[PDB]
Design an enzyme around this catalytic site. Structure first.
Site, short mmCIF file in Angstrom:
data_model
loop_
_atom_site.label_atom_id
_atom_site.label_comp_id
_atom_site.label_asym_id
_atom_site.label_seq_id
_atom_site.Cartn_x
_atom_site.Cartn_y
_atom_site.Cartn_z
N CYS A 73 0.82 -1.19 0.00
CA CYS A 73 0.00 0.00 0.00
C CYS A 73 0.87 1.25 0.00
O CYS A 73 2.04 1.19 0.37
CB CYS A 73 -0.92 -0.01 1.22
SG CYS A 73 -2.12 1.33 1.22
N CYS A 110 -5.13 0.15 10.11
CA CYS A 110 -5.33 -0.79 9.00
C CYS A 110 -5.38 -2.24 9.50
O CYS A 110 -4.49 -2.65 10.23
CB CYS A 110 -4.18 -0.63 8.02
SG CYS A 110 -4.33 -1.66 6.54
N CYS A 127 -2.56 4.14 7.09
CA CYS A 127 -3.65 4.28 8.02
C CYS A 127 -3.33 3.56 9.33
O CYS A 127 -2.99 2.39 9.34
CB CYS A 127 -4.95 3.74 7.45
SG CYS A 127 -5.30 4.39 5.81
C1 LIG Z 1 -7.89 -2.56 3.94
S1 LIG Z 1 -8.69 -1.44 2.79
C2 LIG Z 1 -8.04 -2.03 1.20
C3 LIG Z 1 -8.44 -1.12 0.05
C4 LIG Z 1 -7.84 0.29 0.01
N1 LIG Z 1 -6.43 0.30 0.47
C5 LIG Z 1 -8.68 1.26 0.87
O1 LIG Z 1 -8.19 1.67 1.96
O2 LIG Z 1 -9.81 1.52 0.48
C6 LIG Z 1 -10.42 -2.07 2.64
C7 LIG Z 1 -11.46 -1.39 3.54
O3 LIG Z 1 -11.22 -1.72 4.94
C8 LIG Z 1 -11.33 -0.55 5.70
N2 LIG Z 1 -10.62 -0.78 6.95
C9 LIG Z 1 -9.25 -0.79 7.12
N3 LIG Z 1 -8.88 -1.11 8.34
C10 LIG Z 1 -10.08 -1.26 9.03
C11 LIG Z 1 -10.35 -1.54 10.38
N4 LIG Z 1 -9.41 -1.75 11.28
N5 LIG Z 1 -11.64 -1.69 10.74
C12 LIG Z 1 -12.57 -1.49 9.80
N6 LIG Z 1 -12.44 -1.24 8.50
C13 LIG Z 1 -11.15 -1.12 8.18
C14 LIG Z 1 -10.72 0.49 4.77
O4 LIG Z 1 -10.87 1.82 5.17
C15 LIG Z 1 -11.41 0.12 3.45
O5 LIG Z 1 -12.67 0.77 3.28
S1 SF4 Z 2 -6.82 0.93 4.93
FE1 SF4 Z 2 -4.83 -0.21 4.91
S2 SF4 Z 2 -4.67 -0.95 2.82
FE2 SF4 Z 2 -6.26 0.83 2.67
S3 SF4 Z 2 -5.09 2.82 2.35
FE3 SF4 Z 2 -5.15 2.50 4.54
S4 SF4 Z 2 -3.13 1.41 5.03
FE4 SF4 Z 2 -3.58 1.06 2.87
#
Ligand SMILES: C[S@@+](CC[C@H](N)C(=O)[O-])C[C@H]1O[C@@H](n2cnc3c(N)ncnc32)[C@H](O)[C@@H]1O
Ligand code: SF4
Ligand SMILES: Nc1ccn([C@@H]2O[C@H](COP(=O)(O)OP(=O)(O)OP(=O)(O)O)[C@@H](O)[C@H]2O)c(=O)n1
Ligand SMILES: [Cl-]
Length: 283
Positions: free
Chosen positions: A17, A24, A21
């Protein structure tokens, strides 16, 4: 006995990525991706087991737009899936790619946790005007007849934010509102790649956010109990992940779908409760 039918599947084809975040739950544990042949074969196995909807996730899918574009096209044109969806942080999406692949994409979802830049910086979503990016993506979706979806993570830092004026303009057909989730071995301590603990909220705090926003048709609330086990999670080696129980199966490419799925918990009741089956094909 009967195995469960994997009607709607998330393929996290990369863990790489470009953002950081803080909460994440799908971290950059490896840079391994399957070869395109192997990915196609696993997606075919899933279709053959009853998959109707694929969501491409990660990681950030648009780090690999050629690979993504090829699997998107394959899923619609060759597997005839009902629904091809992608979830993205939006930063790397380019208009010409959306134009090229639009006919094969039902849904494009973009994450936005805040409309306040300082909040984005604090949560690890990074600097710059990410609101103009989100709006741009929505415009590209509407121009190219893709359904536009918004995903929002509700945390201790942003749960008092009012997003209604944006929702009323963007008008996503589907708006996920996730309670931030702790996942064992992903974001649950100071030893993992992320430490989500400072973001957690109570049920009461989550309701502050939900109560302000639940009047929208698009609104889909997912407290922790509805995220824990309600998704089908396929990792970068096409193994199933059980994120609630911290398990990992053998790859479907080696043991098939049915043998792998036997090893994981998928709460179909929770899946149904959160509205996991919906009108996911474009009109
Ligand atoms: C891991 S991200 C992968 C796709 C892309 N990187 C993004 O952030 O949209 C997929 C979804 O999971 C959400 N997400 C990430 N970490 C999370 C958490 N700890 N609890 C809930 N949703 C989460 C993200 O904000 C996103 O909408
Ligand atoms: S939620 Fe995780 S995978 Fe999606 S932008 Fe943020 S750091 Fe990257
Ligand atoms: N315990 C969980 C629950 C969900 N997810 C992931 O969180 C994301 C949630 O995005 P969402 O847009 O809700 O996924 P879809 O499957 O597209 O949702 P729907 O079909 O309901 O629109 C997905 O990548 C899912 O795999 C996860 O990693 N761990
Ligand atoms: Cl839409």
């Amino acid at each position: 006995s009967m195995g469960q039918i994997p009607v709607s599947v998330n393929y996290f084809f990369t863990r790489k990525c470009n953002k950081s975040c803080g909460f994440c739950f799908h971290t950059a544990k490896t840079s391994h991706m399957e070869d395109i042949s192997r990915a196609k074969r696993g997606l075919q196995l899933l279709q053959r087991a009853g998959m109707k909807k694929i969501n491409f996730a990660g990681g950030e899918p648009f780090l690999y737009p050629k690979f993504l574009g090829e699997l998107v096209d394959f899923c619609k044109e060759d597997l005839h899936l009902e629904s091809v969806s992608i979830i993205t942080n939006g930063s790397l999406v380019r208009e010409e790619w959306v134009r090229k692949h639009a006919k094969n994409i039902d849904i494009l979802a973009c994450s936005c946790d805040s409309f306040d830049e300082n909040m984005n910086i604090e949560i690890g979503r990074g600097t710059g005007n990410q609101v103009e990016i989100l709006y741009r993506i929505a415009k590209w979706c509407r121009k190219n007849e893709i359904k536009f979806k918004l995903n929002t993570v509700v945390t201790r830092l942003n749960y008092e934010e009012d997003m209604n004026e944006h929702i009323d303009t963007l008008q996503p057909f589907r708006w996920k509102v996730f309670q931030v989730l702790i996942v064992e071995g992903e974001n649950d301590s100071e030893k993992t790649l992320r430490d989500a603990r400072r973001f957690t909220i109570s049920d009461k705090q989550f309701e502050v956010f939900c109560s302000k926003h639940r009047h929208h048709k698009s609104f889909v609330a997912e407290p922790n109990r509805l995220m824990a086990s309600s998704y089908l999670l396929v990792d970068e080696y096409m193994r199933f992940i059980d994120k609630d129980g911290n398990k990992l199966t053998k790859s479907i490419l080696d043991v098939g779908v049915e043998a792998a799925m036997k090893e994981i918990k998928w709460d179909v009741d929770a899946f149904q409760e959160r509205g996991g089956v919906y009108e996911w094909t474009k009109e």
